[PDB]
Amino acid sequence: XXXXXXXXXXXXXXXXXXXXXXXXXXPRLAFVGFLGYCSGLIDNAIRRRPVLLAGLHRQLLYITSFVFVGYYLLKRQDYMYAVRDHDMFSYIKSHXXXXXXXXXXXXXXXXXXX
Amino acid sequence: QKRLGVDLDRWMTIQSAEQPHKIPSRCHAFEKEWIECAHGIGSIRAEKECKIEFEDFRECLLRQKTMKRLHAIRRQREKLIKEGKYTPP
Amino acid sequence: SMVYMNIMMAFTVSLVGLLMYRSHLMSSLLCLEGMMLSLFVMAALTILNSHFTLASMMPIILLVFAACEAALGLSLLVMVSNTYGTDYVQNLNLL
Amino acid sequence: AKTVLRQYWDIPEGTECHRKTYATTSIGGAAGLVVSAYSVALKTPTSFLEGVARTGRYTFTAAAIGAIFGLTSCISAQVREKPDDPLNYLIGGCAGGLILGARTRSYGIGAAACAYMGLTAALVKMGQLEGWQVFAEP
Amino acid sequence: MLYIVFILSVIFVMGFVGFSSKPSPIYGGLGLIVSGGVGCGIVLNFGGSFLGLMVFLIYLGGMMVVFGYTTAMATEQYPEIWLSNKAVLGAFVTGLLMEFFMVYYVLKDKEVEVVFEFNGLGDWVIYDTGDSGFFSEEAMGIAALYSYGTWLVIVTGWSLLIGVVVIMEIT
Amino acid sequence: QPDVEWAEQYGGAVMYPTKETAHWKPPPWNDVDPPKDTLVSNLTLNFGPQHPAA
Amino acid sequence: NLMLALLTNFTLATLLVIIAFWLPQLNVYSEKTSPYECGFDPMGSARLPFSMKFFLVAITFLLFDLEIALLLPLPWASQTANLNTMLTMALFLIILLAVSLAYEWTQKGLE
Amino acid sequence: XXXXXXXXXXXXXXXXXXXXXXXXXXXXXXXXXXXXXXXXXXXXXXXXXXXXXXXXXXXXXXXXXXXXXXXXXXXXXXXXXXXXXXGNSYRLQAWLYASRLLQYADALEHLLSTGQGVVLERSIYSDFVFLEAMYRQGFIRKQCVDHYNQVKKVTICEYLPPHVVVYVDVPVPEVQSRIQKKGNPHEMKITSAYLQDIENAYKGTFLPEMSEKCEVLQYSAWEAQDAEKVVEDIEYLKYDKGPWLDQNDRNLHKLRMLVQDKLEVLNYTSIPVFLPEVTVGAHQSDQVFQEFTELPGRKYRAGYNEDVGDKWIW
Amino acid sequence: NPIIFIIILLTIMLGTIIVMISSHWLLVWIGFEMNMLAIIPIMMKNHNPRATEASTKYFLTQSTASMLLMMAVIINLMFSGQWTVMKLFNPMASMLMTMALAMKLGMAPFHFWVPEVTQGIPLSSGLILLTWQKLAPMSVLYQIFPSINLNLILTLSVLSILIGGWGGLNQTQLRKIMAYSSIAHMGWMTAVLPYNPTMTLLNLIIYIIMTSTMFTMFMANSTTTTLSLSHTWNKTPIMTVLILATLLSMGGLPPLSGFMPKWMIIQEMTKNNSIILPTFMAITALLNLYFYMRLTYSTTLTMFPSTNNMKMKWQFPLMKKMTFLPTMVVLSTMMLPLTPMLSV
Amino acid sequence: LLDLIWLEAILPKTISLAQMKASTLVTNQKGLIKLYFLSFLITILISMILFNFH
């Protein structure tokens, strides 16, 4: 949802719905960590410095900052998808008449030649 | 707002609020109804339930519903010349 | 309703005035204060008829900002004449 | 105006076409007047003598596109059977783009884009079926 | 005689034609005094003497600054009267037809309008406000206030600090 | 390989050239030459001859 | 009436002009000149820009006049609202105006 | 981040005996070069004269770059016997104009940060004297000069002060005999008309320099070689209505930033225009960029370098 | 210039905050005017004959536009009464509202000022301001997405990419190419506003990062295509690879982050059942690619721009976010599909 | 005929005609604030009269 109805407006973290459990050493976190390492390679190309990989040890700042911001960014991702599912399942149960079930049927269909 | 204000408030924007001294609005009777109808999210987004109270609010500020009514009275008084005239005042 | 229609008609003439340019650049800065004058009368009548008291402060703020742009544009007019000779809409280099 | 456009869709239901020809010129004329208004930004030399000269070349040609398009829509409809079809308006789209090569002496360009103008005219006439929408809401 | 504001609103548009139909910033300058000063009377008749006379304080003072660039910068070549030029007078003669022809429909019945709303007569309905308040009367009677809108005071104070510093950088 | 003859087509003008108008000049590298010329703005006075109180 | 008070003064003022306009008449020769005051033929014909010198000081007035208009609540507003909340805000506008004039001291201009 | 907001400020710790002096337009013979060394009695800083390897003399490397590493085909000995078509002619001068601008950028940076008197041998404002003298004879085509004037209008207008004190030495037309007496054989046997045209152009170069209210003192051949006479003239001459006197806060801050970085000033010097004497060829440019990367001096560039310095890796 | 320049730059930041944190219609009007007083001083800076033309052109084609916005604010007193930034209520109010915002974002009939303004700025840092200013009126449209007539917003989306895709083709000036690339990307922005308001904020995040990198790559002085041509053959060779990566992302291509706008805009539009409109969006997007394609030939080809002058000294620029932002501009595809939810 | 001209002829219909339409939006209007503001007069009249929406 675009507009908030259950959650309070203007908040960095969820806080009201904290119980979800954040990811621990996720495959998504490794790619953001790789992007933090990738930024520490290209900065030595702009400011002409010897070796892309074996250069200065200011790269650790670039790795940490991408992981730190990314962890809070991934926390917002798992929260917003959960609220989306929570509102959707609650809408079906409240109405009941909107959803209809049909299962097990044998019906004829036209078959193509050649 | 894309980003809302927390703790500190800089409101006094909407009609029918805490008055400057004590003096109330001219349309305060119709202003109270619009807040009471549209306090829930599923009212203005639906825009069907509060249709009655919004039309009454349109009558207050524009006075268009009263303008066309008073126009008919003043025209008929001007049309009836030298035939059927009354002046109690 | 009735009085609003005349001052709205005054707005439309001043609207054309900001979109019409002939020789001098001075006409625009008159129309900038002109359009703000027509908006100020419109604001004064709407707030006072259906009384607000709190929101009658708002056009006073609007009147302050009415000449905020007008003072800066009139100061920009000064530096164009220093670079050229006389301020002209007819005289421009950029494409 | 959309009210002028709404009148256009009511005509092909029957067989009458004498009102349809006048309906196309009002849309084609108004579309030319927009292009005629933006051509003022080019700045015409002198006043009125060349100013109205540029308005005349654009508005008359744009109305002529609609006028033939209105006629050819009912030439293909009255002659031979079958009602409204994408192939029926494709013939109408061909004659509309043909006169662009008659405007400037080059025999092609407009006549070269005969299939290009005809296909685009057919694509709007695909929108009579419920499977096409230009601007959506829900 | 019953109309007070409606006759003044005619004079309001009258000065505004001398802006689209460009009469140079001296004859066009007059508009901000003639239609501007009468424009205060439109505010004054409805109520609130403060905000009505507030238009007089700036749009005459700020016009003197504009006058400081009428005899300066650009316009000092020819006076250019709105009664002389064929391109200017043509815009004025069509400009008056946007105002005077509209008043012709006001007399007898409701006036025809480009907008959906009808104008009608409205003589007693021109005020459209009851007495109600007596002591410390009028919404405009206590209009300007530092309280409630405390955030509005800071930004107005900021914007009047920015300009002074900014114009110094331009010049 | 590309040479200077092909590079002159991509020079500062109009990208695709031609068109009704070709009065535009390539922009100067560091803004325009001073338009120091035109308008002297010298005001002449006949203050003296008779009775200026001074 | 305010309208009847203002018009009677204005109509009497313009009527005095007519008295001085129509009564004195005898001859109007090609005698009147453009510059006058000192004499001789005008070297500066019609109009020429002149300009400058006071361009910065005049602009600042247009900026300052809006603030003095925003200072006009002071004797008329401080009657119902709380004084302690107003004190911090009322002085605030006057303090910043002195700051803008302090920036005006570092090179005022040609004037 | 800007450091001018803090304790460091422009025009501070200078002004009194801080103005730059220059010896410009010395016809052909190095007579101004000898008197510049004696001019270091009053002024603290003194810089060497600009040549083909003057930008390569400082920059980063201690030793000067040799031929191919620097500018392609740029020598004073090769320009002495100048030949048209597939030669130096103009491409020497375009490299020479940028080199004089580069050393001036270092000199102005040295003047602003800690106020010291800088003496420069032949300014950027004296370069057109050397160009137009060769233009009078059949050497440089008219189209090349139009390219030079475009560089002239951009590079000069960026910098606010030209020069406070300018020294002009005007010798006799028999200066060619004095040039022949010198030890250099490559510099000898120069054209007599080319040396005379440089003296004629110097008269129309010192006059516009003096018209801009910049202090200029003329010294004769008989008055030459004197150290006490030249040093006394610098202290006596007071700056009046000159362009050197400017705003300390607004004008000086912008000039200090533009002169601090070498890449910021040299970027305007490289013009995007095709010229016959410019060496446009990308195939030769790729091999030249490969040789500069393989060079033991710069190699990786900026502070840290392998097998030359290498102080810190962490 | 020394102290007050930081304050002037801060007032644009503070000016947008007034627009962002708002509930009153006159409060955002103040916020727009806070930008007017604060951009124009940085527009001038060096004071040029080209800068004087652009600063007045930027003023007159934006201050008059905000005056049309105030009309729509006053119609909100004429009709519906309440001073609340939620809905316009009147269709007559929305017409003058949208066309006022079209002078800043819609572009389709109001693009005219952009190429002259962008070229008129002498500074490379001043070029960031125009791409950053567009953040302010977007937050307004994010609030008033209902009530507005979709027939006259989607015309400001379709036509804007047409003129944006054609207007950059006949331009060699590097600032002018980026001026019409702005119009090309702003065309997508006005299309998401009727069809799901989320992702429209992320469209800006992709756009701003991609454009802020672009101008900071031109910290080494370049104003034309031929001046940016001499970058690999004379100056730094590895710098052109990052210019290549940003240009390949500016046009919609899958292995880069610049396809993430094209991902969700069409995805959400098709959910509302529309085929004929997003087809035309994709074909006109090819016209946008052509400008960057010609500008990648300054990084790939030989072209012979060697020149007489050769740089040896190491370049020391400002570079605020020239290292962290291009990495997010190049390789954000795998860490991207879940990000629409994170923005709003 | 086919392999190099007529099968390639679909391309100038989307390139050369596109460049022709491009030149009518770049070289048009020789500067002037006057000209761009003359077009803005029409834009409002399109939305009010030529378009049915309000």
JSON list of C-alpha atoms in Angstrom, two decimals, chain H residues 142-293:
[
{"chain": "H", "resi": 142, "resn": "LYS", "atom": "CA", "xyz": [47.09, 32.63, -40.88]},
{"chain": "H", "resi": 143, "resn": "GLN", "atom": "CA", "xyz": [44.69, 29.85, -39.75]},
{"chain": "H", "resi": 144, "resn": "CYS", "atom": "CA", "xyz": [47.05, 28.78, -36.93]},
{"chain": "H", "resi": 145, "resn": "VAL", "atom": "CA", "xyz": [47.02, 32.30, -35.40]},
{"chain": "H", "resi": 146, "resn": "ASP", "atom": "CA", "xyz": [43.19, 32.21, -35.20]},
{"chain": "H", "resi": 147, "resn": "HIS", "atom": "CA", "xyz": [43.50, 29.04, -33.07]},
{"chain": "H", "resi": 148, "resn": "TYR", "atom": "CA", "xyz": [46.02, 30.87, -30.82]},
{"chain": "H", "resi": 149, "resn": "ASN", "atom": "CA", "xyz": [43.73, 33.90, -30.31]},
{"chain": "H", "resi": 150, "resn": "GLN", "atom": "CA", "xyz": [40.96, 31.57, -29.05]},
{"chain": "H", "resi": 151, "resn": "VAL", "atom": "CA", "xyz": [43.38, 30.21, -26.40]},
{"chain": "H", "resi": 152, "resn": "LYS", "atom": "CA", "xyz": [44.51, 33.81, -25.69]},
{"chain": "H", "resi": 153, "resn": "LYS", "atom": "CA", "xyz": [40.97, 35.02, -24.85]},
{"chain": "H", "resi": 154, "resn": "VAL", "atom": "CA", "xyz": [40.15, 32.13, -22.48]},
{"chain": "H", "resi": 155, "resn": "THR", "atom": "CA", "xyz": [43.40, 31.63, -20.47]},
{"chain": "H", "resi": 156, "resn": "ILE", "atom": "CA", "xyz": [44.16, 35.32, -19.72]},
{"chain": "H", "resi": 157, "resn": "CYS", "atom": "CA", "xyz": [40.65, 36.44, -18.63]},
{"chain": "H", "resi": 158, "resn": "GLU", "atom": "CA", "xyz": [40.51, 33.71, -15.93]},
{"chain": "H", "resi": 159, "resn": "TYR", "atom": "CA", "xyz": [43.42, 35.32, -14.03]},
{"chain": "H", "resi": 160, "resn": "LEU", "atom": "CA", "xyz": [42.76, 38.73, -12.44]},
{"chain": "H", "resi": 161, "resn": "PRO", "atom": "CA", "xyz": [46.23, 40.29, -11.98]},
{"chain": "H", "resi": 162, "resn": "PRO", "atom": "CA", "xyz": [48.71, 40.40, -14.92]},
{"chain": "H", "resi": 163, "resn": "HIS", "atom": "CA", "xyz": [51.98, 41.82, -13.47]},
{"chain": "H", "resi": 164, "resn": "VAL", "atom": "CA", "xyz": [52.72, 44.59, -10.96]},
{"chain": "H", "resi": 165, "resn": "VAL", "atom": "CA", "xyz": [56.23, 45.51, -12.20]},
{"chain": "H", "resi": 166, "resn": "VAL", "atom": "CA", "xyz": [57.30, 44.81, -15.81]},
{"chain": "H", "resi": 167, "resn": "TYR", "atom": "CA", "xyz": [60.91, 45.20, -17.01]},
{"chain": "H", "resi": 168, "resn": "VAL", "atom": "CA", "xyz": [61.51, 45.88, -20.72]},
{"chain": "H", "resi": 169, "resn": "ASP", "atom": "CA", "xyz": [65.05, 45.76, -22.16]},
{"chain": "H", "resi": 170, "resn": "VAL", "atom": "CA", "xyz": [65.39, 47.41, -25.59]},
{"chain": "H", "resi": 171, "resn": "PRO", "atom": "CA", "xyz": [68.81, 46.84, -27.26]},
{"chain": "H", "resi": 172, "resn": "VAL", "atom": "CA", "xyz": [70.35, 48.06, -30.56]},
{"chain": "H", "resi": 173, "resn": "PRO", "atom": "CA", "xyz": [69.49, 46.45, -33.98]},
{"chain": "H", "resi": 174, "resn": "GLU", "atom": "CA", "xyz": [73.08, 45.08, -33.84]},
{"chain": "H", "resi": 175, "resn": "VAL", "atom": "CA", "xyz": [71.91, 42.49, -31.26]},
{"chain": "H", "resi": 176, "resn": "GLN", "atom": "CA", "xyz": [72.50, 39.72, -33.85]},
{"chain": "H", "resi": 177, "resn": "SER", "atom": "CA", "xyz": [76.27, 40.26, -33.45]},
{"chain": "H", "resi": 178, "resn": "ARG", "atom": "CA", "xyz": [75.86, 39.86, -29.66]},
{"chain": "H", "resi": 179, "resn": "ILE", "atom": "CA", "xyz": [73.83, 36.65, -30.23]},
{"chain": "H", "resi": 180, "resn": "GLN", "atom": "CA", "xyz": [76.57, 35.30, -32.54]},
{"chain": "H", "resi": 181, "resn": "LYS", "atom": "CA", "xyz": [79.16, 35.85, -29.77]},
{"chain": "H", "resi": 182, "resn": "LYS", "atom": "CA", "xyz": [77.30, 33.33, -27.55]},
{"chain": "H", "resi": 183, "resn": "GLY", "atom": "CA", "xyz": [78.58, 29.75, -27.13]},
{"chain": "H", "resi": 184, "resn": "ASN", "atom": "CA", "xyz": [75.49, 28.03, -28.57]},
{"chain": "H", "resi": 185, "resn": "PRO", "atom": "CA", "xyz": [75.85, 26.99, -32.27]},
{"chain": "H", "resi": 186, "resn": "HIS", "atom": "CA", "xyz": [72.18, 25.95, -32.73]},
{"chain": "H", "resi": 187, "resn": "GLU", "atom": "CA", "xyz": [70.86, 29.35, -31.55]},
{"chain": "H", "resi": 188, "resn": "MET", "atom": "CA", "xyz": [73.27, 31.10, -33.96]},
{"chain": "H", "resi": 189, "resn": "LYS", "atom": "CA", "xyz": [72.56, 31.86, -37.67]},
{"chain": "H", "resi": 190, "resn": "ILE", "atom": "CA", "xyz": [69.01, 33.09, -36.95]},
{"chain": "H", "resi": 191, "resn": "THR", "atom": "CA", "xyz": [67.11, 35.39, -39.36]},
{"chain": "H", "resi": 192, "resn": "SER", "atom": "CA", "xyz": [67.91, 39.12, -39.03]},
{"chain": "H", "resi": 193, "resn": "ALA", "atom": "CA", "xyz": [64.34, 40.14, -39.93]},
{"chain": "H", "resi": 194, "resn": "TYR", "atom": "CA", "xyz": [62.90, 37.79, -37.26]},
{"chain": "H", "resi": 195, "resn": "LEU", "atom": "CA", "xyz": [64.93, 39.45, -34.47]},
{"chain": "H", "resi": 196, "resn": "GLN", "atom": "CA", "xyz": [64.03, 42.95, -35.74]},
{"chain": "H", "resi": 197, "resn": "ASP", "atom": "CA", "xyz": [60.29, 42.10, -35.86]},
{"chain": "H", "resi": 198, "resn": "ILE", "atom": "CA", "xyz": [60.41, 41.01, -32.19]},
{"chain": "H", "resi": 199, "resn": "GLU", "atom": "CA", "xyz": [61.83, 44.44, -31.24]},
{"chain": "H", "resi": 200, "resn": "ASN", "atom": "CA", "xyz": [59.15, 46.22, -33.32]},
{"chain": "H", "resi": 201, "resn": "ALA", "atom": "CA", "xyz": [56.32, 44.19, -31.72]},
{"chain": "H", "resi": 202, "resn": "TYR", "atom": "CA", "xyz": [57.71, 44.84, -28.20]},
{"chain": "H", "resi": 203, "resn": "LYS", "atom": "CA", "xyz": [57.02, 48.58, -28.68]},
{"chain": "H", "resi": 204, "resn": "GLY", "atom": "CA", "xyz": [53.35, 47.71, -29.33]},
{"chain": "H", "resi": 205, "resn": "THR", "atom": "CA", "xyz": [53.31, 45.33, -26.34]},
{"chain": "H", "resi": 206, "resn": "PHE", "atom": "CA", "xyz": [54.79, 47.54, -23.58]},
{"chain": "H", "resi": 207, "resn": "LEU", "atom": "CA", "xyz": [52.45, 50.43, -24.53]},
{"chain": "H", "resi": 208, "resn": "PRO", "atom": "CA", "xyz": [49.16, 48.51, -23.94]},
{"chain": "H", "resi": 209, "resn": "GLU", "atom": "CA", "xyz": [50.74, 47.06, -20.75]},
{"chain": "H", "resi": 210, "resn": "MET", "atom": "CA", "xyz": [51.45, 50.59, -19.45]},
{"chain": "H", "resi": 211, "resn": "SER", "atom": "CA", "xyz": [48.00, 51.85, -20.54]},
{"chain": "H", "resi": 212, "resn": "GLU", "atom": "CA", "xyz": [46.32, 49.41, -18.10]},
{"chain": "H", "resi": 213, "resn": "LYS", "atom": "CA", "xyz": [48.00, 51.36, -15.21]},
{"chain": "H", "resi": 214, "resn": "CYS", "atom": "CA", "xyz": [50.63, 48.65, -14.61]},
{"chain": "H", "resi": 215, "resn": "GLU", "atom": "CA", "xyz": [54.10, 49.87, -13.54]},
{"chain": "H", "resi": 216, "resn": "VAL", "atom": "CA", "xyz": [56.78, 49.59, -16.24]},
{"chain": "H", "resi": 217, "resn": "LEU", "atom": "CA", "xyz": [60.40, 50.81, -16.13]},
{"chain": "H", "resi": 218, "resn": "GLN", "atom": "CA", "xyz": [62.61, 50.85, -19.24]},
{"chain": "H", "resi": 219, "resn": "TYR", "atom": "CA", "xyz": [66.31, 49.96, -18.99]},
{"chain": "H", "resi": 220, "resn": "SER", "atom": "CA", "xyz": [68.94, 50.75, -21.66]},
{"chain": "H", "resi": 221, "resn": "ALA", "atom": "CA", "xyz": [71.95, 48.67, -22.81]},
{"chain": "H", "resi": 222, "resn": "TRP", "atom": "CA", "xyz": [74.32, 51.19, -21.15]},
{"chain": "H", "resi": 223, "resn": "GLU", "atom": "CA", "xyz": [72.16, 51.10, -17.98]},
{"chain": "H", "resi": 224, "resn": "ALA", "atom": "CA", "xyz": [72.17, 47.26, -18.04]},
{"chain": "H", "resi": 225, "resn": "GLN", "atom": "CA", "xyz": [74.07, 44.86, -15.69]},
{"chain": "H", "resi": 226, "resn": "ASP", "atom": "CA", "xyz": [73.46, 47.21, -12.72]},
{"chain": "H", "resi": 227, "resn": "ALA", "atom": "CA", "xyz": [72.09, 45.40, -9.64]},
{"chain": "H", "resi": 228, "resn": "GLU", "atom": "CA", "xyz": [71.69, 48.36, -7.24]},
{"chain": "H", "resi": 229, "resn": "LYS", "atom": "CA", "xyz": [69.88, 50.50, -9.86]},
{"chain": "H", "resi": 230, "resn": "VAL", "atom": "CA", "xyz": [67.29, 47.81, -10.73]},
{"chain": "H", "resi": 231, "resn": "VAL", "atom": "CA", "xyz": [66.58, 46.87, -7.08]},
{"chain": "H", "resi": 232, "resn": "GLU", "atom": "CA", "xyz": [65.96, 50.52, -6.09]},
{"chain": "H", "resi": 233, "resn": "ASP", "atom": "CA", "xyz": [63.42, 50.97, -8.93]},
{"chain": "H", "resi": 234, "resn": "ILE", "atom": "CA", "xyz": [61.18, 48.16, -7.58]},
{"chain": "H", "resi": 235, "resn": "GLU", "atom": "CA", "xyz": [60.83, 49.82, -4.14]},
{"chain": "H", "resi": 236, "resn": "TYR", "atom": "CA", "xyz": [60.35, 53.31, -5.64]},
{"chain": "H", "resi": 237, "resn": "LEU", "atom": "CA", "xyz": [57.53, 52.41, -8.07]},
{"chain": "H", "resi": 238, "resn": "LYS", "atom": "CA", "xyz": [54.14, 52.60, -6.33]},
{"chain": "H", "resi": 239, "resn": "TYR", "atom": "CA", "xyz": [51.02, 50.90, -7.73]},
{"chain": "H", "resi": 240, "resn": "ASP", "atom": "CA", "xyz": [48.34, 53.40, -8.80]},
{"chain": "H", "resi": 241, "resn": "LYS", "atom": "CA", "xyz": [44.96, 52.53, -10.42]},
{"chain": "H", "resi": 242, "resn": "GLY", "atom": "CA", "xyz": [46.35, 49.06, -11.28]},
{"chain": "H", "resi": 243, "resn": "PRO", "atom": "CA", "xyz": [44.39, 45.80, -11.80]},
{"chain": "H", "resi": 244, "resn": "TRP", "atom": "CA", "xyz": [46.48, 44.09, -9.06]},
{"chain": "H", "resi": 245, "resn": "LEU", "atom": "CA", "xyz": [44.52, 45.97, -6.38]},
{"chain": "H", "resi": 246, "resn": "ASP", "atom": "CA", "xyz": [41.33, 43.91, -5.95]},
{"chain": "H", "resi": 247, "resn": "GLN", "atom": "CA", "xyz": [38.87, 42.51, -3.36]},
{"chain": "H", "resi": 248, "resn": "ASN", "atom": "CA", "xyz": [40.54, 40.44, -0.62]},
{"chain": "H", "resi": 249, "resn": "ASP", "atom": "CA", "xyz": [37.55, 38.18, 0.19]},
{"chain": "H", "resi": 250, "resn": "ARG", "atom": "CA", "xyz": [35.60, 37.76, -3.08]},
{"chain": "H", "resi": 251, "resn": "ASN", "atom": "CA", "xyz": [38.17, 38.16, -5.90]},
{"chain": "H", "resi": 252, "resn": "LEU", "atom": "CA", "xyz": [41.23, 36.51, -4.27]},
{"chain": "H", "resi": 253, "resn": "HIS", "atom": "CA", "xyz": [39.37, 33.33, -3.20]},
{"chain": "H", "resi": 254, "resn": "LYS", "atom": "CA", "xyz": [38.41, 32.31, -6.76]},
{"chain": "H", "resi": 255, "resn": "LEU", "atom": "CA", "xyz": [41.92, 32.94, -8.17]},
{"chain": "H", "resi": 256, "resn": "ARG", "atom": "CA", "xyz": [43.54, 30.86, -5.40]},
{"chain": "H", "resi": 257, "resn": "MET", "atom": "CA", "xyz": [41.42, 27.77, -6.20]},
{"chain": "H", "resi": 258, "resn": "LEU", "atom": "CA", "xyz": [42.02, 28.00, -9.98]},
{"chain": "H", "resi": 259, "resn": "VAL", "atom": "CA", "xyz": [45.82, 28.26, -9.55]},
{"chain": "H", "resi": 260, "resn": "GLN", "atom": "CA", "xyz": [46.16, 25.52, -6.87]},
{"chain": "H", "resi": 261, "resn": "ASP", "atom": "CA", "xyz": [45.41, 22.58, -9.20]},
{"chain": "H", "resi": 262, "resn": "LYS", "atom": "CA", "xyz": [47.46, 22.12, -12.39]},
{"chain": "H", "resi": 263, "resn": "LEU", "atom": "CA", "xyz": [44.65, 20.16, -14.12]},
{"chain": "H", "resi": 264, "resn": "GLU", "atom": "CA", "xyz": [42.11, 22.98, -13.63]},
{"chain": "H", "resi": 265, "resn": "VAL", "atom": "CA", "xyz": [44.20, 25.58, -15.50]},
{"chain": "H", "resi": 266, "resn": "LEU", "atom": "CA", "xyz": [45.53, 23.32, -18.29]},
{"chain": "H", "resi": 267, "resn": "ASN", "atom": "CA", "xyz": [42.02, 22.07, -19.23]},
{"chain": "H", "resi": 268, "resn": "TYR", "atom": "CA", "xyz": [41.12, 25.39, -20.89]},
{"chain": "H", "resi": 269, "resn": "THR", "atom": "CA", "xyz": [44.48, 25.41, -22.75]},
{"chain": "H", "resi": 270, "resn": "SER", "atom": "CA", "xyz": [43.51, 22.25, -24.68]},
{"chain": "H", "resi": 271, "resn": "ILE", "atom": "CA", "xyz": [41.02, 23.39, -27.34]},
{"chain": "H", "resi": 272, "resn": "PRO", "atom": "CA", "xyz": [38.67, 21.05, -29.27]},
{"chain": "H", "resi": 273, "resn": "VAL", "atom": "CA", "xyz": [39.74, 22.28, -32.73]},
{"chain": "H", "resi": 274, "resn": "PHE", "atom": "CA", "xyz": [41.47, 20.51, -35.63]},
{"chain": "H", "resi": 275, "resn": "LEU", "atom": "CA", "xyz": [44.81, 22.02, -36.70]},
{"chain": "H", "resi": 276, "resn": "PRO", "atom": "CA", "xyz": [47.59, 20.88, -39.14]},
{"chain": "H", "resi": 277, "resn": "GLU", "atom": "CA", "xyz": [50.31, 21.65, -36.55]},
{"chain": "H", "resi": 278, "resn": "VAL", "atom": "CA", "xyz": [48.65, 19.95, -33.55]},
{"chain": "H", "resi": 279, "resn": "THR", "atom": "CA", "xyz": [49.31, 16.19, -34.11]},
{"chain": "H", "resi": 280, "resn": "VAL", "atom": "CA", "xyz": [45.78, 14.74, -34.11]},
{"chain": "H", "resi": 281, "resn": "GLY", "atom": "CA", "xyz": [46.70, 11.07, -34.83]},
{"chain": "H", "resi": 282, "resn": "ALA", "atom": "CA", "xyz": [45.22, 8.69, -32.26]},
{"chain": "H", "resi": 283, "resn": "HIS", "atom": "CA", "xyz": [47.48, 5.78, -33.32]},
{"chain": "H", "resi": 284, "resn": "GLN", "atom": "CA", "xyz": [50.60, 7.76, -32.33]},
{"chain": "H", "resi": 285, "resn": "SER", "atom": "CA", "xyz": [48.79, 9.05, -29.21]},
{"chain": "H", "resi": 286, "resn": "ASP", "atom": "CA", "xyz": [48.15, 5.48, -27.96]},
{"chain": "H", "resi": 287, "resn": "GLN", "atom": "CA", "xyz": [51.85, 4.55, -28.21]},
{"chain": "H", "resi": 288, "resn": "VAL", "atom": "CA", "xyz": [52.80, 7.83, -26.47]},
{"chain": "H", "resi": 289, "resn": "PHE", "atom": "CA", "xyz": [50.36, 7.08, -23.61]},
{"chain": "H", "resi": 290, "resn": "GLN", "atom": "CA", "xyz": [51.84, 3.57, -23.33]},
{"chain": "H", "resi": 291, "resn": "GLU", "atom": "CA", "xyz": [55.41, 4.93, -23.06]},
{"chain": "H", "resi": 292, "resn": "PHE", "atom": "CA", "xyz": [54.34, 7.47, -20.39]},
{"chain": "H", "resi": 293, "resn": "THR", "atom": "CA", "xyz": [52.71, 4.65, -18.38]}
]
